[PDB]
């Protein structure tokens, strides 16, 4: 099942960028896996189902952050100059947000890792897994994306969007305009739905 989840995320990144761009990010994913493995080794946290599920969750989140970083990099470099420095500003800008969101998520995970109940045992493993994985993931994303880009990435191009998603964009922009046409209606709908 682990390999299955890995390959589905793989095809996700494949169809996302089309080109073999996010594929290098996928190649970078196993790194954090080995790191958390050695971490468990030092902490003797052996393997079991629970930890595997935690691994799946953590891998999804970390690959999400890494992929969005790579996407914004390639987009900002494609729409403009083709240079590592033509992306250093993107790094300097969107760096802090990644850290913030990641830490916020680890905080949201924390609760399950504090109960003294008999159930807290199974939760302790997944908590440690998620925490270490997410942190090492952020450091990897901010410390490896440069070389991986400077060596396995083409130059810039001209703006263009996949026409298949064109109809989806039409519907999205239209619904956006309509939602702006009557803001109070959206609030009413949200209220009734939540209630």
């Amino acid at each position: 099942a682990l390999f299955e989840a890995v390959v589905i995320v793989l095809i996700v990144s494949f169809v996302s960028l089309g080109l073999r761009a996010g594929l290098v990010v996928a190649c970078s994913i196993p790194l954090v896996l080995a790191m958390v493995f050695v971490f468990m080794e030092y902490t003797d946290i052996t393997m079991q189902r629970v930890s595997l599920g935690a691994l799946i969750i953590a891998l999804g989140l970390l690959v999400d952050d890494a992929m969005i970083t790579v996407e914004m990099m390639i987009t900002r470099l494609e729409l403009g100059d083709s240079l590592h420095d033509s992306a250093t500003y993107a790094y300097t800008s969107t760096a802090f947000p990644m850290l913030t969101g990641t830490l916020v998520t680890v905080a949201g995970f924390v609760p399950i890792g504090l109960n003294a109940s008999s159930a807290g045992e199974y939760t302790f493993t997944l908590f440690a897994v998620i925490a270490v994985a997410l942190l090492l993931s952020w450091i990897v994303a901010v410390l490896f994306a440069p070389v991986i880009a400077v060596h396995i990435l083409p130059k810039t191009l001209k703006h263009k969007s996949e026409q298949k998603k064109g109809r989806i964009a039409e519907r999205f922009d239209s619904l956006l305009h309509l939602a702006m046409r009557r803001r109070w209606t959206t609030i009413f709908l949200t209220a009734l739905l939540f209630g």
Partner: protein, 97 residues
């Protein structure tokens, strides 16, 4: 995700551009990434969904993720622009900005 969006919005708004067009460009710029974010979030749990252990939690996760994302796409824009066009609350303090 919500933090990412608000940061992207107020990011270029520092230039004092048209709030309408500002939020418009913010959405047009964050449309593609948030999609992949929601994908990676919801997915991953699919192959293990067959496992009876991680059962209801998997469905609840994949459901709430899609819901929260859709609203992150439509709800917050209208809400923020509404709160912007006019301050609904009051309670003004004479000794504070």
């Amino acid at each position: 995700n919500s933090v990412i969006l608000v940061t992207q919005i107020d990011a270029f708004e520092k230039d004092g551009k048209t709030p309408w067009e500002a939020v418009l460009e913010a959405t047009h710029h964050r449309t593609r990434p948030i999609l992949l974010t929601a994908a990676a979030a919801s997915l991953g749990m699919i192959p293990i969904a067959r496992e009876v252990f991680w059962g209801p939690m998997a469905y609840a996760m994949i459901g709430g993720i899609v819901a929260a994302t859709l609203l992150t796409l439509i709800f917050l824009p209208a809400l923020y622009v509404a709160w912007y066009r006019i301050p609904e609350p009051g309670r003004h303090h004479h000794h504070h900005h």
